[PDB]
Design a protein around this ligand. Sequence first.
Ligand SMILES: Nc1ncnc2c1ncn2[C@@H]1O[C@H](CSCC[C@H](N)C(=O)O)[C@@H](O)[C@H]1O
Ligand SMILES: O=c1ccn(O)c2ccccc12
Ligand code: NA
Ligand code: NA
Ligand code: NA
Length: 215
Amino acid sequence: ESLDLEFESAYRGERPPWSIGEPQPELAALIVQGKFRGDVLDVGCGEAAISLALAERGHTTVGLDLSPAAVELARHEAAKRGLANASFEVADASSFTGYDGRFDTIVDSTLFHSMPVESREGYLQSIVRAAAPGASYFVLVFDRAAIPEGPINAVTEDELRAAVSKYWIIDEIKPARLYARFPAGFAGMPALLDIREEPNGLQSIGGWLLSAHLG
Ligand SMILES: Nc1ncnc2c1ncn2[C@@H]1O[C@H](CSCC[C@H](N)C(=O)O)[C@@H](O)[C@H]1O
Ligand SMILES: O=c1ccn(O)c2ccccc12
Ligand code: NA
Ligand code: NA
Ligand code: NA
């Protein structure tokens, strides 16, 4: 019912498959299209490869994660790179304040399914409160067709639309790939999940890419 210990352990190295050392490809694709604007919030940032990429491009970025190990790793990576633009804080995405009207772009790179269904309303009210007028919002989340009921709260397209449309104006929801480097034999033989083998030793699982804004 709570993943806090699991995420803390995965970041402490007791490396996470989703820590691919680059922003998620579906989200990098939006960055090159010029969709990321002004001050950015990387919500449930983890090791924050997307925050680092945006800070290198000139954005002032803030990454929030419930995991103190994730925050420390994100801060350690920004310091190795000599980034002054990127900051990180330990926070619960479902219930945080102190950033009223701050951000022009809010990105959720796989945080969405990493919290309980019941926490979604608190999370959506928190990020809207943290949004500047006319802010953009991007979500990359697992598809319920690929990830079953259990520790991960993956969504159907209709479920994602219903949840987010209450708070933001949705521009697009389209199928997407979530990339990771899984260990050999991950999820068994035969495999209990549909894991696609990708070029450059990567794997991917089915998901959704949502694009929204305030207007
Ligand atoms: N309630 C919550 N508040 C903030 N972060 C949370 C959270 N629940 C889960 N998380 C974080 O959500 C992340 C999901 S994993 C994805 C991490 C990163 N965005 C990436 O793309 O690599 C983890 O870092 C986890 O600690
Ligand atoms: O194994 C995973 C557990 C949680 N998250 O969010 C992921 C994201 C992308 C790829 C893999 C994972
Ligand atoms: Na969580
Ligand atoms: Na669950
Ligand atoms: Na696509």
